[PDB]
């Protein structure tokens, strides 16, 4: 399985790296494009020649050695953030030889002349590109750093986890009181699920050579004024079910915490309080009553609720409750860049260990429907467009993470 062949067999389109602000180089890609030329090794000949970008898919570039024109006989895919890609001028700056592919060595006669003619004015890689690449992959979370994280088996409490590995900004955490042999939690270092040691007590969230994580390293949460009209216990809303990212569910505000966090319960599936999960009020995972109907999204009603189809108006009268007002959910919709059909590499939020060949299949504003290629649609997930659990084609190869293929 190659992303290159997959994308070529089917003329697929990859989300540009630019859609993923949290990924390596997600902020430094603005001048990468088709017909950028680079210096890369000449495999047809230890030495280098010029290649132009025929096709760009996430981090992956389809390159054609200069002098080939429309002949794709030796086009080859590679990772533009990989270690043998250099800007035009790198050989000359290092005193290295530019040597033509054996295949077109006789196609043109005057090579120096030919390179002045082709490269004069050429777009190439930003300067400092290779330093920026290399800074990109230097993550601030280290092994042995302790964090607070949601308890997989008891969502309403945090427990303490320790970073055992970093791969590509993703952390494999291990619970400090492990309850089985292989007792990890995989998440991005910008996950909204991890917090400084002392977070739970500070905010009123329940809780069950290592050192505390420097509090400054955590993703910043948007500041909210919760002192006028706010959420209040018993208000209804819709919420992506944390145990089932395929579904948006009928839900209720169960606790209003400090700093804007909310304990939310899925009606029909609530124990004691142990199933409450914590979303920030600005979370893209909760929506007002009506969101689903107005947008043609399957709303999942409470377990055991028989009067179908579900009607909110009836459920409000029955449970004697009100909708959280729509204004409480206002938030920007970034111009995220994603388009239906777009390929990318996604985390399977039901088994986060796995990162998978995937496609965006619906966009409702900032909300994406993510499909895992080759698998059942039933298991498509709802994910925000700024999720830190989405990545560009090539990210696995770049960081050394194992990629699951389709099907």
Tokens at 401, concatenated: 């993470």
Last residue of a domain, one of 225, 256, 277: 225
Same domain, 113 and 21: yes
Looking at the fold, whether 406 and 290 belong to one and the same domain comes out as no
- Residue 352: Cβ-neighbour burial (10 angstroms; 0-12, 13-18, 19+): middle
**Which of 279, 261, 281, 294 is CA-nearest to residue 331?**
281
Final residue belonging to a domain, choices 115, 136, 157: 136
Among 136, 154, 173, where does a domain finish? 136
Closest by CA to 32, choosing from 74, 81, 99, is 81
Experimental approach: X-ray
Q: Are 379 and 48 in contact (CB under 8 A)?
A: no
* CATH code of the domain covering residue 200: 2.30.30.140
Is there a contact between 342 and 355 (Cβ–Cβ < 8 Å)? no
Per the listing, tokens 């997989």 go with 152
What is the residue range of 234's domain?
Answer: 226-333
Cβ contacts of residue 171 below 8 Å, gap of 6+?
Answer: 141, 163, 165, 186, 187, 188, 189, 191, 194
For residue 152, how many other CB atoms are within 10 A of its CB? 13
- Do 272 and 321 belong to one domain? yes
**Is the same domain home to 39 and 165?**
no
Q: Are residues 257 and 379 located together in one domain of the fold? A: no
Say which residues have a Cβ less than 8 Å from residue 363's Cβ, sequence separation at least 6. 338, 339, 340, 369, 385
Pair 118, 217 in one domain = no
Pair 118, 77 in one domain = yes
Contact indicator for 253, 234 with CB cutoff of 8 Å: yes
- As a whole number of angstroms, the distance between CA 256 and CA 246 comes to 26
In this structure, the answer to whether residues 124 and 177 fall within a common structural domain is no
CA angle 7, 8, 13 (to 5 degrees): 40
CB-based contacts of 373, cutoff 8 Å, min separation 6: 356, 357, 358, 359, 406, 407
Rounded to the nearest angstrom, the gap between the alpha carbon of residue 30 and the centroid of all alpha carbons in its chain is: 19
CA 237 centroid distance within chain: 25
Question: Residue 342 and residue 97: Cα distance in Å, rounded?
Answer: 39
9/52 same-domain check: yes
Q: Which of 18, 17, 54 is nearest to 34 (CA)?
A: 54
Same domain flag for 343 and 357: yes
Q: Please name which of 155, 146, 144 lies closest in space to residue 197, comparing C-alpha atoms.
A: 146
Residue 74 · residue 103 · CB < 8 Å: yes
Asked if 62 and 125 sit in the same domain, the reply is yes
Backbone angles phi, psi at 52, to 5 degrees: -110, 150
User: What are 206's two structure tokens?
Assistant: 């329940």
Long-range CB contacts for residues 180-184, cutoff 8 Å, separation at least 24: 184/353
Resolution number, Å: 2.5
Check if the beta carbon of residue 249 is closer than 8 Å to that of residue 238: yes
Do 210 and 144 meet the contact criterion of CB atoms below 8 Å apart?
yes
Breaks following residues of the chain (C-to-N distance > 2.5 Å): 45, 208, 271
357 & 241 share domain: no
Domain count, the chain: 4
Point out which residues pair with 147 in neighbouring strands.
161
* 74 vs 103: CA distance, rounded Å: 9
Three-state secondary structure along the chain?
A: CCHHHHHHHCCCCECCHHHCCCCCCCCCCCCCCCCCEEEEECCCCCCEEEEEEEEEECCEEEEEECCCCCCCCCCEEEECCCCCCEECCHHHHHCCCECCCHHHCCCCCCHHHHHHHHHCCCCCCCCCHHHHHHHHCCCCCCCCEEEEEEECCEEEEEEEEEEEEEECCEEEEEECCCCCCCCEEEEECCCCCEECCCHHHHHCCCECCCEECCHHHCCCCCCCCCCCCCCCCCCEEEEEECCEEEEEEEEEEEEECHHHEEEEEECCCCCCCCCCEEEECCCCCEECCCHHHHHCCCEECCCCCCCCCCCHHHHHHHHCCCECCHHHHCCCCCCCCCCCCCEEEEECCCCCCCEEEEEEEEEECCEEEEEECCCCHHHCEEEECCCCCEECCCHHHHHCCCEECCC
């Amino acid at each position: 399985f190659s992303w290159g062949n997959y994308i070529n067999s089917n003329s697929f389109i990859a989300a540009p790296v630019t859609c993923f602000k949290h990924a390596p180089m997600g902020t430094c890609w603005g001048d990468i494009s088709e017909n950028v030329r680079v210096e890369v090794p000449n495999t047809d000949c230890k030495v280098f020649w010029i290649a132009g970008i025929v096709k760009l898919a996430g981090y992956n570039a389809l390159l054609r050695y200069e002098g080939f024109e429309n002949d794709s006989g030796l086009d080859f895919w590679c990772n533009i953030c990989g270690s043998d890609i250099h800007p035009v001028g790198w050989c000359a700056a290092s005193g290295k030889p530019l040597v033509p592919p054996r295949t077109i060595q006789h196609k043109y006669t005057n090579w120096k002349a030919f390179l002045v003619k082709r490269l004069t004015g050429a777009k190439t890689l930003p300067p400092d590109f290779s330093q920026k690449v290399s800074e990109s992959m230097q993550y601030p979370f280290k092994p042995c750093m302790r964090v607070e994280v949601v308890d997989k088996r008891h969502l309403c409490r945090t427990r303490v986890a320790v970073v055992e590995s970093v791969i590509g900004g993703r952390l494999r955490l291990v619970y400090e009181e492990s309850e089985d042999r292989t007792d990890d939690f995989w998440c991005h270092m910008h996950s909204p699920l991890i917090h400084h040691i002392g977070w739970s007590r500070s905010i009123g969230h329940r809780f069950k050579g290592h050192f505390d994580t420097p509090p400054h390293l955590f993703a910043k949460v948007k500041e909210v004024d919760q002192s006028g009209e706010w959420f209040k216990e018993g208000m209804k809303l819709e919420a992506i079910d944390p145990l089932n990212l395929s579904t948006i569910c009928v839900a209720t505000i169960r606790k209003v915490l400090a700093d804007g966090f909310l304990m939310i319960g899925i009606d029909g599936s609530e124990a004691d309080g142990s199933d409450w999960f914590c979303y920030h009020a600005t979370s893209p995972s909760i929506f007002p009553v009506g969101f689903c109907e107005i947008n043609m999204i399957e709303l999942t009603p409470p377990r055991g609720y028989t009067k179908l189809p579900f009607k909110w108006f009836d459920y409000l009268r029955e449970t004697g409750s009100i909708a959280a007002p729509v204004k409480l959910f206002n938030k920007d919709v970034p111009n995220h860049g994603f388009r239906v059909g777009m390929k990318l590499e996604a985390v399977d939020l039901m088994e986060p260990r796995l990162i998978c060949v995937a496609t965006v299949t619906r966009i409702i504003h900032r909300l994406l429907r993510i499909h895992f290629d080759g698998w059942e649609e039933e298991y498509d997930q709802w994910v925000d467009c700024e999720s830190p659990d989405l990545y560009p084609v090539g990210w696995c190869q770049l960081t050394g993470y194992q990629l699951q293929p389709p099907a």
